[PDB]
Amino acid sequence: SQQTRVLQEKLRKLKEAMLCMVCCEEEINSTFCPCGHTVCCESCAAQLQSCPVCRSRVEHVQHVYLPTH
Amino acid sequence: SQQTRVLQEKLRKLKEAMLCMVCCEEEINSTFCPCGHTVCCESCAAQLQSCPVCRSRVEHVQHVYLPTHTS
Ligand SMILES: CNC[C@@H]1COc2ccccc2O1
Ligand SMILES: [Zn+2]
Ligand SMILES: [Zn+2]
Ligand SMILES: [Zn+2]
Ligand SMILES: [Zn+2]
């Protein structure tokens, strides 16, 4: 039904929100510290000097284990 | 249809996976450091001296800003 289509769209958007903002291919699993933006996969986060969201200096990257992984 | 019920269940399970494992009421937004388990809201994470997943000591809690975060 049309309701089935609406739910498919919501599921797709939620799943897309869990993907890396740089490569759009791998799941987010890394946090820029200390700002806390958690928007990249490990490969993309490794090479950034500043947060791509707020421009804060990245002191280090913390790996995150999320239940959604 | 039956597929509407199947999709409702998938959406419910994905949303439940983003809720705190202790209170079951608030969204996850905190990481236990250094183990990295990210399974609690800020209120439950503040009260735990050991990670509830792996029992490693919590040195500190890092707040996480996730694109999935909602109000
Ligand atoms: C994921 N938890 C965020 C919110 C923020 O404001 C809060 C205020 C009072 C109780 C809980 C609260 O939790
Ligand atoms: Zn990436
Ligand atoms: Zn940032
Ligand atoms: Zn909680
Ligand atoms: Zn842990």
UniProtKB/Swiss-Prot annotation, chain B:
<feature type="region of interest" description="Critical for homodimerization">
    <location>
        <begin position="64"/>
        <end position="66"/>
    </location>
</feature>
<feature type="zinc finger region" description="RING-type">
    <location>
        <begin position="20"/>
        <end position="55"/>
    </location>
</feature>
<comment type="function">
    <text>E3 ubiquitin-protein ligase that mediates ubiquitination and subsequent proteasomal degradation of myosin regulatory light chain (MRLC), LDLR, VLDLR and LRP8. Activity depends on E2 enzymes of the UBE2D family. Proteasomal degradation of MRLC leads to inhibit neurite outgrowth in presence of NGF by counteracting the stabilization of MRLC by saposin-like protein (CNPY2/MSAP) and reducing CNPY2-stimulated neurite outgrowth. Acts as a sterol-dependent inhibitor of cellular cholesterol uptake by mediating ubiquitination and subsequent degradation of LDLR.</text>
</comment>
<protein>
    <recommendedName>
        <fullName>E3 ubiquitin-protein ligase MYLIP</fullName>
    </recommendedName>
</protein>
<comment type="subunit">
    <text>Homodimer. Interacts with the E2 ubiquitin-conjugating enzyme, UBE2D1 (via RING-type zinc finger). Interacts with myosin regulatory light chain (MRLC) and TMEM4.</text>
</comment>
